[PDB]
Structures are given as structure tokens and as C-alpha cells.
Design a protein around this nucleic acid. Sequence first.
DNA 1: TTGACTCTCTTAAGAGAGTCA
DNA 2: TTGACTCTCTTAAGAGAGTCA
Lengths: 162, 162
Amino acid sequence: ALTNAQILAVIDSWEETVGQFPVITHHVPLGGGLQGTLHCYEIPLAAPYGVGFAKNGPTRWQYKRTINQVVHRWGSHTVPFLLEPDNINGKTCTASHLCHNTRCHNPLHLCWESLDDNKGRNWCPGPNGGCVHAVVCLRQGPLYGPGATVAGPQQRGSHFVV
Amino acid sequence: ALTNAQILAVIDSWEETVGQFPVITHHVPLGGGLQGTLHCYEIPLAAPYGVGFAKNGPTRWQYKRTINQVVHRWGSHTVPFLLEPDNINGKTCTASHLCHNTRCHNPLHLCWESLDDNKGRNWCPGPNGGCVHAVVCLRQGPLYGPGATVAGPQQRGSHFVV
DNA sequence: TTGACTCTCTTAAGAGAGTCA
DNA sequence: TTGACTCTCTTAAGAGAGTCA
Ligand SMILES: [Mg+2]
Ligand SMILES: [Mg+2]
Ligand SMILES: [Zn+2]
Ligand SMILES: [Zn+2]
Ligand SMILES: [Zn+2]
Ligand SMILES: [Zn+2]
């Protein structure tokens, strides 16, 4: 809600509830031929999810609290960042999964950044493969690699140069 | 329907027309602190665009030819790839700008790949900065870099470990 | 046959809000 | 007040199809 105290209280309640989610170990590529271990705090697959949580989409959830008799609701991964600016360079800030695991609500696996920065982590080589993200990646992005291009640049005639 | 010879004739007429688009020289980052040059063949900003071309969206165009009284229409960047497979790994193939310049229709600046591969080139370090795309990038992706993350992973209590 | 407009849709990373019990 | 559902929207890389003269 409006007060910093009320916001800190929302963050504290969220952390307490998510801290009781099942902790699932995931071994992950780091880049550079190395592997690491992440501990994700995963929201349940079906109701009940936890106090204050409800599912609004196949992999979308919301957290809600009643403050001053009014319901306040947020995207379930945005709560850690309620005291941060909600935009940057005129772009909306988004909750970004460093573990690339949507059900995870571990705030040690989340950052707050533009949707472009968020998306781009999918292709990052990872913290041991050359990640240059100032807020460093926790793993190599799941889509990093050579790709599967069907056809490359080509011309039939002689009208074009690179 | 259309024979492979009719398709080649469409590609040839498309190349003839695109080859007469204004050619703009762009200096671009290659990665590794190096600079290179790309020559983009840019569709005009407003009508007329060129024989067979029409705008269906702010940065979307289509190419149209009528053959034996039947109207055929294609996305304006898909024409170079009409003799190629149109899917791979269960994913639709898309025209992917190696020059990251949507108005460009230079077929030497295009490849044909999944939408995920396509998007990922936005963050590639480039052909002189560590690109691992099998069909190599022509330049560093426009969104490559440290990013502008507003807040990193953090917790208020001690409920979480990474 | 052609040009110049019109409309809505896909994907996968993210969102806000209403209806009931 | 709290839970469990419902719906559509945003973005930026990409698409298909209709109308009129
Ligand atoms: Mg993400
Ligand atoms: Mg692209
Ligand atoms: Zn996680
Ligand atoms: Zn990274
Ligand atoms: Zn180009
Ligand atoms: Zn590349």
C-alpha cells in the first residue's frame, strides 16, 4: 500500500510465505563447460498455492493483501521490488528470472530490469562463458548456442553486396 | 500450385525491384571493438515502395504477384526463401535481419530461422566478439552489453539461499 | 493485375483486472 | 478477508488476409 512501512510488511509476508514453498535443486550450465547448482523455491502446480497467492494464467500468479480494508494486488514476482523505480529510460521494469524457472519465487533468483534486458538473458553464454550483464547471470541462457538456421544469406543474381 | 520455375521467377522479379531501392551505407559494431560496414537496400518510408510492394503495418510489408489470374502474396522479407523448408524442429521459419534494419530488404542481410534464433541475434557479441551462430552474424546485436538493471537479487530476511 | 490502404494474428519473455464463493 | 477461478493486455522480433478502383 501507500506507506513504506506497509510496503516492507507486504515484502516480509511474501518472503515468509515463499520461504515455505518446496525447495527444488536444479543443476545448470554456467558456460565454459562448468556446471552449478541453484535452489528454486517453487510455487505449487495447483491450488492451494500459499497465503495470498492465486493463479491468473498457466504460468502467471498474483499476490494480494487487504490493507486499510482495501485489496492491493501485484504480479507475484514483482513484490521484492515494490520500493524500486517502476521504469528505466522510459521502459517498464519487469521481474526477470535469473534461473529461467517461472514457478520459482526465490528473490535471490530475480532482478528488476527492462523487458529487453530480461529477454536477452535467454541467450547469454553465462557467468563462466562470458556474461557481461552488470547484474550477473546465474546460468547460461537456455537458448544460447549455434541455432538451427535453415537458410543463410543468398542472392540469385548480381544486384547486391554485403 | 506455382512450379519451382514460377517461384524462381518471383524471386528474380523481387531481386530486380529491391536492387533498385536506395542503398544506404551504415558503419556498425562487429564486436571486439572493431567497426565494419553494411550496405542496406531500404524500402521507402511512404508509398510508392516499388513494383509489387505494399505496406501492411508500420514496419511490415508484403510482396504480391498475379500468376495465371491468381493473386499470390508473401511477407516482403520471405521471398528469398520460397524454395527452402518453412519449418525446423517443429518451429516456423522467419526472415531474420542480420543487419537489424527492418526496412532493409537486401537478401545478403537475411537468414531463415526460428523466431527464437532470430530474436537472440539482438544480444549477440558479433562476428569479432564471440558469435557462435552457425550462420554467422554480420554485426554485434544492438542490445548487446551490460544492460540497465535497476535492482538485483536481494532478500530482507534469511529465508532464502541461492 | 496492380497500388494503397484496411484489419487481425504469432511467440515467449512479461502484465492488469473482474467474477464468484 | 481470503481463495480460486475467469478474462484481456504489453513488447518487439515476426506473420496472413480483405476492400476498392
Ligand atoms: Mg526472463
Ligand atoms: Mg531479427
Ligand atoms: Zn529459481
Ligand atoms: Zn548474462
Ligand atoms: Zn541491411
Ligand atoms: Zn551471432
